[PDB]
Symmetry: C3
Subunit: 366 residues, 3 copies
């Protein structure tokens, strides 16, 4: 008969899921950003150009004024179109003369014989082209699209665990177990060899596997604990829906006091842990200790939860069990993100080196 | 005594191996090539060279004829020997005096200004020399030798699981369990505290751990299931070698319905799960619930499989249990395949940007 | 009642730690070589410098001697104090004329006409300027600072397992169990529901969980094994501290005969396996089978170990159980080291191409 500690293995696997919820999942990565460097290189290119070129960006009416594209349109073969928005962004601070003087000495390029400036201007244009050729590689924006945020991943984890965007408090305010569809008795709520459960998320599955009730409190109700039962007082025959005080007495079995560095292989190992413990039967798969008939909490029956999406003839948990599929989505986004962050580090290092050399007057006069 | 659900741990470990078999293991890595981009750069260098240099790769007779090295030997005062094959290969279309002009304009290099051509040629030159340097990296071919195919890996996995190159069908057609060595009774087949099993692959080990028979169907035969026993009807004392019908009744407990991305970490975890469940003794190591004397399937004996290659005094499974060593070989070959990928595509991104710059007419004119 | 094999799950998780100890944990990742490439480009740049420049790094008394800065202070009208230490590292070998002539030959610079030498020198100084700027990326300096060694992590793992820098021999010489604080009986040594154990490391936690004593050898003392009990002969009511012979009879249950590839994900998984197996109560957390009151080894009580640092209301094992926090440091170091190796890949490959380019005479003369 199912007694004390007989569900420690299933509790450990499920708690590996519950501990990821809340704000406890951390991305802990460096968003690669080379836009400031690029915008500065482009400013250096415009700062070092000939005034004739910058005068193409002034307004014919007023000097320190953006060229009104409606007033002075662009030529035909000019190809200046579409590059104007990037150029004007670099030219807008330099339309003022005082700033242009300031940027000249900031970039350490003011006060040189024309030949020296000619030499520096040529390399900077070449350098600026190399920086643009990398920043505009179609691999970028591809990787940038595959970037996620810590908050988007946290919301998905809390949806897979609680079906909410945030982890409920210790009273589970704004939370109702089993979507409010618990009905008759624990076997109807938690499932059987012929029927699925009413638990759609991870937390309610954990309650089906670990909660004690008024009947098993001295035997099967200690399957996830050691010396003292959870003491939920759950009486599903009378009141089916567990109250928040009961849910918290089961969640406290899981580590809700730490943090986890979000890795894709970390999610994979936790989902694999849960999925491999499902025992595949003719009509359902069972997670937890099961002896006979159903998941009623009876010490001769089972302390478990049942799913109809996975059987000994079909089903992959991370694809067909909804809450597991949601967490597998988080793993997939973590993968795309980790590959994107890595791929965007190469142009970031290149553009930093371009900017560093462009501000070395010695390297420019070689 | 051994009862329902007592081998869920071992079933999860062994099914983590089984699900890797068939064609379910995917090598989703991208085999890199940059030969496309490199060859185009080399053509550009020759398309931009002096016609005296293109005339070097022609026969002294017909202009469209290539130079016969036997007819015209190479100048021994020059290094023109080693690089002659790559030069001609790129030049071979350019020997045609019409393809040259087409390519000359196709690379935005046909035009005017013999001075501005020489400018372009000089930059194409440097870009080419840097491109061949970025890809020259000696340690190649041996790195391409440390490359495998998804098919070769899957054949090794199936050899670890089934001793075959392909997974048997749902009738185990063409499959003989235990290498056709089963005899006497279940303990002789599956081992004991003093002797090993006849099972040399993973599937047959899972059968020893999880099969019910004609005696334990109401007790220990339910060790890996929840509701109903597998139902093999195995009777080794009458017929030792089980049928495919019986074998499939156990394999249906594992997930044969999905896929698994092949990573060396994925193989390592699954091998450690099985390896650390081996209970090390003086003469054998036992996988599965063991109580008394042998792995006979009796509820007072054991539902297990025994190995003599690792004990409490010797042996590491990933090197001394043949089927685990074969699966570890997939892990070693995959960590080499991964390591060679990075060291064969690092030029790929650098070569691609060089082509964009070499095809930019402005970049040629600095 | 606690019987044969009831602690296999706990043995496998704790043996996942013990097997990391000794010199079995391996840092198989390639060790970066970034500074060595940079140091080589610096030495090449010095060989190519004018003899007047190299003469600035010798004192006036014996050319073979390095210039003493106190004897010949650097010109306060130069930035030479900013580059002297690196400059001197490159000059010192070349101070000897043979070593200089040999380097000029190795780098294909010896026997060069003045114009060709100056042309090559200028290109080498441009490549050298690019290599230095690349090393100035803060991510490069951070990555080299985040690189670990295998020996450092091996000492840390052994400190988590044995509280020692080296794994004790098969008689545990120099090792005293429970830091010499065992007393009274097994329940005070291994803990209870109200009190923590005297086990500060992982090896003594494995002993509490798996050691038979002179009273449970036929029942609970087989919780970690199959047929034959460990046979320690432990009698904590007479002599509390177990002898090294007893400790080894438990350690022989783990695989100490192989190796483990070190990785942050591999350490995280092994820690999680132990951390979530801890059954969290109001006053202690228990690892192992538990039925009644304490971890006394009695079949009606428990084969377990107790911690007071984690409860159902507080604590994360990897931060609050000291030996687990030690092992978690290894993971964090492996995290930064793995990111550092990845970030140093492209710049080290980029410096390598600079070295081969600076050793191609054709490229230097373009
Ligand atoms: C690869 O190898 C090359 C050599 O092949 C090597 O190049 C060397 O680069 C360094 C700089 O990194 C050069 O150092 C310069 O040296 C000159 C000359 O100093 C001598 O001559 C002066 C008189 O002209 C004497 O007074 C003096 O005693 C020395 O004998 C210095 O003049 C340079 O310093 C000036 O500029 C610095 C900034 O760049 C200032 O910090 C410094 O205060 C000096 O300022 C002077 O000029 C200012 C105007 O700009 C003026 O305002 C000040 O009042 C002041 O007068 C500088 O130290 C060295 O010459 C190069 N070696 C050569 C060409 O042979 C590379 O370093 C090497 N690569 C790497 C990475 O190691
Ligand atoms: C890309 O195209 C451009 C051409 O526009 C080039 O960059 C390159 O083609 C060729 O690259 C090779 C590799 O360096 C160059 O070879 C060198 O040619 C030198 C001159 O050739 C000889 O010409 C006549 C015929 O014999 C002779 O009278 C001359 O005296 C002269 O020797 C040649 O001197 C040199 O040989 C040297 O080889 C080693 C170099 O250190 C030493 O053993 C020794 O110094 C020896 O002298 C070498 O063979 C070639 O010039 C160049 N083509 C042109 C037109 O410049 C293309 N690159 C790629 C890979 O696509
Ligand atoms: C950086 O600044 C320098 C100028 O000092 C240039 O390298 C470049 O400014 C302009 O670059 C564009 C091309 O990107 C040139 O436009 C060309 O105009 C031609 C007609 O006159 C047309 O036929 C071509 O197709 C181009 O569109 C423009 O001349 C040039 N400005 C000059 C030379 O003053 C800047 N580059 C970047 C990356 O911002
Ligand atoms: C679960 O199975 C037990 C034993 O057959 C039964 O008593 C319960 O009623 C059932 O829910
Ligand atoms: C396994 O051990 C049990 C108990 O001793 C015995 O009854 C069986 O015959 C044996 O195979
Ligand atoms: C552990 O619990 C059992 C059963 O109550 C008791 O007999 C032992 O004395 C205790 O250590």
């Amino acid at each position: 008969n199912i007694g004390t500690g007989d569900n420690v293995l299933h509790r450990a696997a499920l708690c590996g899921i519950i501990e990821l919820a809340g704000k406890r999942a951390k991305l802990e990565t460096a968003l690669p950003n080379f836009q400031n460097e690029l915008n500065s290189i482009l400013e250096l290119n415009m700062t070092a150009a000939e005034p004739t070129w910058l005068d193409q960006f002034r307004d014919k009416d007023d000097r320190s004024k953006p060229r009104d594209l409606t007033k002075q349109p662009l030529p035909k073969d000019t190809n200046w179109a579409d590059h104007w928005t990037a150029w004007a962004k670099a030219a807008l601070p330099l339309l003022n003369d005082e700033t242009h003087q300031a940027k000249l000495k900031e970039y350490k390029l003011a006060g040189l014989q024309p030949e020296k400036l000619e030499r520096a201007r040529n390399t900077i244009r070449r350098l600026t082209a190399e920086a643009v050729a990398k920043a505009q590689d179609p691999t970028v924006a591809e990787s940038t699209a595959d970037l996620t945020t810590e908050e988007d991943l946290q919301k998905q984890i809390n949806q897979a665990v609680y079906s909410k965007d945030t982890e409920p408090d210790d009273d589970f305010n704004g939370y109702t177990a089993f979507e409010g569809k618990a009905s008759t008795n624990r076997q109807t709520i938690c499932g059987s060899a012929v029927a699925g459960s009413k638990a759609t998320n991870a937390m309610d599955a954990l309650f089906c596997v670990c909660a004690d009730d008024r009947t098993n409190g001295a035997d099967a109700g200690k399957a996830c604990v050691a010396g003292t039962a959870p003491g939920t007082g759950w009486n599903p025959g009378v009141t089916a829906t567990p109250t928040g005080t009961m849910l918290q007495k089961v969640r406290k079995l899981c580590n809700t006091h730490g943090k986890t560095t979000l890795s894709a292989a970390a999610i994979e190992g936790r989902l694999t842990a849960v999925g491999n413990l499902l025992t595949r039967g003719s009509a359902t798969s069972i997670l937890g200790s099961f002896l006979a008939t159903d998941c009623s909490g009876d010490q001769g029956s089972g302390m478990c939860v049942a799913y109809t999406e996975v059987t000994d003839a079909k089903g992959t948990p991370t694809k067909d069990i909804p809450w597991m599929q949601k967490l597998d989505s988080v793993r997939i986004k973590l993968q795309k993100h980790e590959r994107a962050v890595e791929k965007l580090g190469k142009p970031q290092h290149d553009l930093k080196t371009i900017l560093t050399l462009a501000k070395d007057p010695a390297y420019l006069q070689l």
